[PDB]
Structure formats: structure tokens, C-alpha cells
Amino acid sequence: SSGLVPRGSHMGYSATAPVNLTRPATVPSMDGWTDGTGAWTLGEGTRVVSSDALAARAQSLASELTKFTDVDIKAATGSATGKDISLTLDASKKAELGDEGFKLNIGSKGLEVIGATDIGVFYGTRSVSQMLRQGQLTLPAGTVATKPKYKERGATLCACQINISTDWIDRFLSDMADLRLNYVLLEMKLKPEEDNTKKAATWSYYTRDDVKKFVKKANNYGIDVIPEINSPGHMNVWLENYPEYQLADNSGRKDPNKLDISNPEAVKFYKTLIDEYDGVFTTKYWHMGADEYMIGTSFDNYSKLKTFAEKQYGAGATPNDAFTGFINDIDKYVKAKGKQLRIWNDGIVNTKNVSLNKDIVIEYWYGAGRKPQELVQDGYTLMNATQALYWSRSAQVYKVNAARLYNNNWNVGTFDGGRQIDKNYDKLTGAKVSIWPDSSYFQTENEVEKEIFDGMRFISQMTWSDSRPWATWNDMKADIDKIGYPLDIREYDYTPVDAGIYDIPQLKSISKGPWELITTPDGYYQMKDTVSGKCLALFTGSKHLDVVTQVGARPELRNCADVSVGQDQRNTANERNTQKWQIRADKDGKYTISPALTQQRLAIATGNEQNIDLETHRPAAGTVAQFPADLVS
Ligand SMILES: CC(=O)N[C@H]1CN2CC[C@H](O)[C@@H]2[C@@H](O)[C@@H]1O[C@@H]1O[C@H](CO)[C@H](O)[C@H](O)[C@H]1O
């Protein structure tokens, strides 16, 4: 017999360690590790030790680690032993570590994490978590210092038209933090409240309270949440109920997506929205979008913009001049609020009489004029937002292929359509992936979460480390899976009730029930009415992106779809996903039921709910209908 037995190494440092004991991987990788003598073992008595100032970081890591290791790891102040993880903020190490970098020293004095800022120290702790939650509690001795090559690292998250649940955003923010991603462009609607703007309070929207909560979580994780209100195109969710601000073509037909930038009341309406967001986002940036204004058409069909150009910016001025002038005017406005402006690159056009202010950050997603190289020569600040880092729930041409980017040597300097610029260009801020809903019924938000996993590790690695220490994608994939998700995601209670048979009074107007609940692989439920044999669906009402956004829409009974299959069954996606429901536990113990796609909540209608959609149609009082949560607290 073999005698196989656990090594069961004593806690703390040991001068003795095997030469090739595995150093557990991280993402981002920490390159240039210098090996030392021996190894350090987390074990019973290991504490996380820090100053009072770092006490919250220390307590949160001790908790975390207690949960991952099954050892009781307490936080403390005072002296550290060789048994301990130490957290140190040393601001004098800015030159070495920057605002975000960190140093690990593993050895006889234990596991030391050193940062020059609170966020650096926090970031060090993400590597410590990663390293110790792979089933190994012994780490080889040595030292490494690491900092991100690029200043902006993260994602565009389009929480736009459709709602991405605040619980999803929270999980996403923890995922980002674990990967040392510090940037999220959140295109979204903050519920408008002013008399002048409140008719745009259609769903999706987020409350002021919702936003202040996820922003404060973001800032604790080192993440800049930058809002976007795209303009002057892609404005349907703002101008639908304000036709007075929509741009008409030459024949008088209005487009709810197009802002009439020759109308000063319209410009002012946009500026009013900037002012509403200013109260709840802490960032120093404003993103005005400026992408795809004329998609589906041309400036030749909007002669009003030419006339406006010429009046406004003198004879010779073109519609492109008016467009840029609108951008410059929004620039001037946000700068007076202390902000820097950001846009998409496809706005930037050939202008005769006006030129785009150079103090506007250009996020470059589309190979169409200027090319990246030309924007470099004229001195623009650039972020790489290449389409090669796009996911879309419906557009299958937009699926990040991380294997391919890894194996083909893509870097942050590889702009859209393989246009390589100097990756050390001094105004290259970094790079991001982009998460787009488009036609939204094809994939649930929890399916988006599973899918983006890999691409998020890829962009973390290349924006921080800009290296390929794994020989192939497949090696990186093996390690990123061993690393796995941060604790908050592992703890999220996706399906808080067991499958089974339930009485649900809230649903009495549809059926006396009872209801058979079964779970789905993406963390939702199907609800079968045992009376009719049919299943509850949120299927009918007015939609954006092919999803029912109508406030007060009623669910219905439909033939049961197969909710057990994956997102590659595109042909049945709508019947399937309109039959998914998210159940959540209250603080404490009461359950809400939300349609998985819409993320409104089922409630009994009172008739006192106030929303613009309800002015035009209200479900019968006392029936069960979907409503944003803020209307039913
Ligand atoms: C900046 C950008 O990429 N603009 C649109 C084009 N791309 C190409 C692939 C994606 O489908 C993406 C579109 O989703 C982008 O538009 C955004 O669409 C959302 C809804 O999906 C909102 O309407 C935004 O305002 C658009 O910018």
C-alpha cells in the first residue's frame, strides 16, 4: 500500500521547501518574481495584521480567507509574526508602485503586502486571495513588485433600454476588482425627476439610491464608474416622449433616436440630464457617446443642420461642423463642472470651420476615419475599445475570442481591424471589453456572466501585465479556472428556494395554483401552474430591444418551454427566456419574483403607482403585473 498522507505542514515560514513547489497563478500575472529560500504556510493562528487605518481591509481579507481555507483567520493590529499576512500602506513608494501597484514579500517575516495607496494595498490583497484559494496553503518564498502598464482597464457595460440588475452589477464589480480592472463605462438611465425630464422615466432606469450604492461599492474597489448618455444619436429612450426635441429630415419625419442639435431647448434638455447625473456619480468624467448619429441615413437628408452650421459657425460650415460644435459645446459645459469629456471615435469627422477640442478622450472602436495612427499624430488621447473585444447577446459576429487574441499577439496598441499603433504611445490610456445587449431575449444576464468570464481575464492580463507568461491560451485557461471567481460571486444566492411545489398568493389572479418550481442552469426558475399545465411568462407589452419594458405589463400562461437548454438554442430563445423568473430573498425572509429578462418585479397593482407608461395604460387594479421595484416598496 502507498501510504499516501497529507503533508500537513506547520503554519508560518519554513526554511525548507521543495525547489519546484508550485507558485499558484494569479490574473493579472505578477511577472519577475524573485524566488527566495523556503516557503510560507497559512495555518491555525495566522492572522491578517495591519494599522488602524487598514483595519477594514484587514478584517475583510481575514473573513474572506476564513471562508476559502476553512481556517479561522482573525484580523489584528500591532506586531506581525512570521505566521501572519501583513498589510502595509507606504506612500513613499509611489515611484516604484504608482497609484495602483503593490509588492509581495513572502518569507520569514510572513506574507507582506505593500502598497503606496489604499487601492494598491487592496489590489495586493486580490493576489493574496487568488493565490490561497486554489487548495494550496503553502506559498514559495520570495518577492515581487507589480504595477499596471495602463491607467484605464475594464469594460463598457451597456445597461441601456434593458435593465441589468443591481445585483448583477454588484457581482460584476467584485469580478472586476478581483482582476484589478478599474474602469466601467456604464451607459444607463438614471431615473429623471425634473418636470422638464420626467416623461423619460421609462424602464430601464436606476434610482438615485441604487446608483449611490453601486458607485460607493465601486469606489471601495478602486473602480471609476463613468456614466454615458449617448447623444446626439441613439436617444430613443430619452426622446420617445419628447418629440419636440427630435430631429426631422427634409420631409418632416422625426426620429426619436436623433436629438435636434439646432434646437437650443433640446441641447438644454441634454444638459439638464448631465446635471441630474452629477449628484450621484463621483467620477471626474462625462461620456456623451457621439456614435452612429446618422446610421441608417446621411446628413444630406437633414438640410436644417447645414443651415444651422452656416449660421452658427460661418459660411462654408457643414453638418459635420455642427456635430463637432455640439461636442465642443458639451465639452465646455462639463469642464465648467470640473469634468473631462469622453466620446466614441466615429463621431470625429472631416470638419471645415470647427475642430474638435483635443482635451476630449477618444475611445476608439471603429476603423473609420481618422485611422488610429492619424489620431496619434494629432495628439489625441486614446483608449482602445476595439470591436474584437465586443460581446453582443444577439449579434454573433460580436463574441470575444480570447484564445485567438492571446495566440495571435494582440496588445493594447492593436486598435480596431488590426491597426497597430505604438503600444507605448504616451496618451494611450488603456483598453476595454464591451458588453452590449442588442436584441436581448437570446441570452439572460446570467448567461452573459458565464460567457464573458474568459474575455475579462484576457483584458485584465493585457492591460496590467501586457505579457504572455502562459505558453498558450489553453495554459492560461487552466489557471484562470483554478483561480475562479471572487467570494461574493461564489456566495450569491442564485436560487434561494428549492425546486418543488409552492403556494403563491401573489399569483392568485392568474391561477389558484399551486405552482411547480424548477431551477435552470443560469440560476432562474420556471413556474408551472398545476391547474392549467401551462407556465408563467412575461411575454406581452411594449418593448425595447425585443424585451418587454412596459411598466405594468401583465404575465400570462403559455405552453411550457424547455428551460433546461443553453443559449445556443437561438430558435426557441424568446419562449424559453420569457419563462425564466428570478426569485430573491428580502431582508429578511420574504420573496420577490422578477421576470428574468425585464428585471421589474411582480406586484399586485394598487392603481397608485406613478409612471409615464401608466398614464397611457394601467393594468386593472388588484391584478398582478410587473413594475420597477421603486414603485412597489
Ligand atoms: C459605440 C458602438 O459600438 N455603437 C453601437 C454599435 N456597436 C457594434 C456592436 C454592438 O451591437 C454595438 C451597438 O450595440 C452599439 O450601440 C449601442 O446600442 C445600445 C443598445 O444595444 C444603446 O442603444 C447605445 O446607445 C448604442 O450606442
Curated annotation (Swiss-Prot):
Q: Does the keyword Repeat apply?
A: no
Q: Name one GO biological process term.
A: carbohydrate metabolic process
Q: EC top class, in one word?
A: hydrolase
Which UniProt keywords are given for this protein, alphabetically ordered?
A: Cell membrane, Disulfide bond, Glycosidase, Hydrolase, Membrane, Signal, Transmembrane, Transmembrane helix
Q: How does it sit in the membrane?
A: Single-pass membrane protein
Field pH dependence: Optimum pH is 4.5 with LNB-beta-pNP as substrate and pH 6.0 with PA-lacto-N-tetraose.
The active site annotation covers 292 (proton donor/acceptor)
Disulfide bridge positions per record: 158-160, 535-560
| EC annotation from Swiss-Prot or TrEMBL | 3.2.1.140
Catalyzed reactions per annotation: beta-D-Gal-(1->3)-beta-D-GlcNAc-(1->3)-beta-D-Gal-(1->4)-D-Glc + H2O = beta-D-galactosyl-(1->3)-N-acetyl-D-glucosamine + lactose
- Residues annotated as binding beta-D-galactosyl-(1->3)-N-acetyl-D-glucosamine: 161, 187, 230, 291-292, 390, 438
Q: Which GO terms describe its molecular function?
A: beta-N-acetylhexosaminidase activity; lacto-N-biosidase activity
Substituting residue 234 to F results in: Does not affect the affinity for LNB-beta-pNP, but shows a reduced kcat value
Any one of the GO CC terms: plasma membrane
Cellular compartments annotated: Cell membrane
> Does Chloroplast count among this protein's keywords?
no
Q: What else is known?
A: HMOs function as prebiotics, promoting the growth of bifidobacteria in the gastrointestinal tracts of breast-fed infants, which in turn promotes optimal health.
Function recorded in the entry: Present in the infant gut, this enzyme is involved in the assimilation of type-1 human milk oligosaccharides (HMOs). It hydrolyzes via a retaining mechanism the beta-D-GlcNAc-(1->3)-beta-D-Gal linkage in lacto-N-tetraose (LNT or beta-D-Gal-(1->3)-beta-D-GlcNAc-(1->3)-beta-D-Gal-(1->4)-D-Glc), an abundant HMO unique to human breast milk, releasing lacto-N-biose (LNB or beta-D-Gal-(1->3)-D-GlcNAc) and lactose. Is a key enzymatic factor for growth and proliferation of B.bifidum in the gut ecosystem of breast-fed infants.
For this chain, the family text in UniProt reads: Belongs to the glycosyl hydrolase 20 family.
Identify this protein by name. Lacto-N-biosidase
